[PDB]
Symmetry: C2
Subunit: 311 residues, 2 copies
């Protein structure tokens, strides 16, 4: 099985850590906080890592059956968390958390949805605090908490299927900071993480990480004063499904890709997609100034010692 | 270039008319209302039709720059609302061509209902903003007019002072209204894209199986319902001809059709065999030799292409 990458242009593709179109290409330096994404992790061989799911609608979310408090103004909701396919989450399995679980610290605003109940369907505005400031973000233990904002009393009875779907993160002066590079405590304050997908840092000199950018919406209680935000991922969802389906064996540490712009009738730049599923370019940190209507094309397998032409 | 379909299991794939995982397979009969979807339209050769976009996050939504009004019980709750006016554009940010080959901008909602969601103003230098919102796509609202280059978004209960012109906005769908005396959600009913005054144009063609004993196979998802926190409205579904992963697969592949339909087999790894077979017609829909109603098969199986066949090929019953 010969290797290949999707022929879709970048602005057609989507973020694998957040529900959004890709609208930017940026190069990140080797900052103190190392990239440790749990979502959007796929090898060139199509091996999924961390909490990565192929179900785009399950990304950065929680779903499962409601349960009572004792079994574990606003209204609290308790879920026994499960996988996107509906099968139960394996506590002592090979994952730090259920697939699609948020992989960063913030207060995440969104909707709590109870779609199938015979007594009638329900939804309400909700938020999930994934910072260590909240003791009850514990999806690694099999249960987690969701807060229904301003209402929801009488609707959180046990035995019903719920979903939390993300809309935005909180911003503003006295709200918890949104830190997309900061991994949460999946097991809460009392316990440790396990089976995390490995850190991403370029080994070779002169090679920096290339990230796919999206806008990150911000909630500030209707003020409209909080500063605009971004969120990033190693590979687009369309890349991940392509590789997973293909299951092509890696023939070298990296695949040399060229970014091809039909209008310009030429290649604009080239990059290295490493076996571990991240891209690098010989370029300094910061936003790349290229049109997003170009696509990546695979040309050959190269070693880690291959010297890229500057961007 | 040989034809093929994705090897992904069904419960891994997503709906091309709504933001949701696929969780059902159902067979629809030839009802009075013919399937006329504008989103989720792709031929087996990878030709996109209607308002179909490859950007899954732009599906059933509206985006563009804000504009002034001059540029363009129920009554009580309405007074508390704020209207937002957008000059609609494509997902890539390029302007909508009013006299182009589309009934509306790509990703526009293709059914009549009140759609609840979020109005997002994500990049403004003065600070980012969002608010709870709804879009009335029924002929009951004169101002759903995306075909004309402008449409309306209603901010529920607030938003005054935030709807100034010149800023980038998005409307993203969360649910449809379902309350007792609220507009009906009718996923098979095409909206008036130009409003009451003008007619639609360049609609993707109707879908109805020609061959006898063949009914349409649809991919089902849950549809969330908003009823102002009552929780009494009955549960809903939404359907599509092909999953998003099918559409991107065909678009990238660009394989020429060698016959009227592609014979697909549904393969279940645990059972170690094919469970049923179907026909994927060139026009981009699937059919099966089966009566109407929900199919009872596990969703951890995948479709596999076996050969090109004519419309007269007789499928084995499901």
């Amino acid at each position: 099985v010969s290797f290949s990458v999707p022929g879709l242009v970048v602005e057609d593709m989507s973020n694998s850590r957040w529900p959004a179109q890709i609208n930017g290409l940026v190069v990140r330096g080797n900052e103190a906080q190392v990239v440790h994404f749990q979502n959007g992790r796929c090898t060139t061989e199509g091996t999924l890592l961390g909490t990565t799911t192929l179900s785009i609608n399950s990304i950065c979310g929680l779903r499962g059956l409601s349960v009572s408090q004792a079994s574990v103004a606003d209204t609290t909701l308790w879920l026994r968390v499960e996988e996107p396919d509906g099968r139960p989450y394996d506590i002592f399995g090979d994952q730090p958390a259920p697939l699609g679980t948020p992989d960063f610290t913030a207060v995440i605003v969104g909707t709590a949805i109870r779609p199938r109940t015979a007594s009638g369907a329900y939804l309400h505005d909700a938020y999930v605090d994934t910072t260590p400031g909240d003791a009850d973000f514990t999806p690694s233990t099999g249960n987690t908490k969701i807060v229904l904002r301003g209402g929801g009393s009488g609707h959180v009875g046990q035995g019903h299927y719920w979903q939390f779907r993300p809309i935005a993160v909180e911003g503003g002066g006295s709200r918890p900071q949104y830190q997309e590079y900061n991994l949460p405590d999946y097991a809460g304050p009392t316990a440790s993480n396990h089976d995390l997908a490995p850190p991403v840092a370029p080994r070779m000199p002169g090679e920096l990480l290339l990230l796919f950018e999206s806008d990150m919406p911000v909630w500030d209680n209707g003020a409209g004063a909080a500063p605009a935000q971004k969120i990033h991922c190693l590979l687009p969802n369309e890349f991940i499904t392509h590789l997973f389906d293909l299951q092509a064996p890696a023939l070298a540490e990296a695949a040399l890709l060229r970014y091809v712009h039909p209008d310009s009738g030429r290649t604009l730049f080239e990059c290295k997609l490493y076996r571990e599923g991240y891209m690098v370019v010989a370029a300094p940190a910061g936003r790349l100034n290229f049109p997003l209507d170009g696509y990546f094309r695979f040309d050959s397998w190269v070693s880690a010692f291959y010297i890229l032409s500057p961007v």
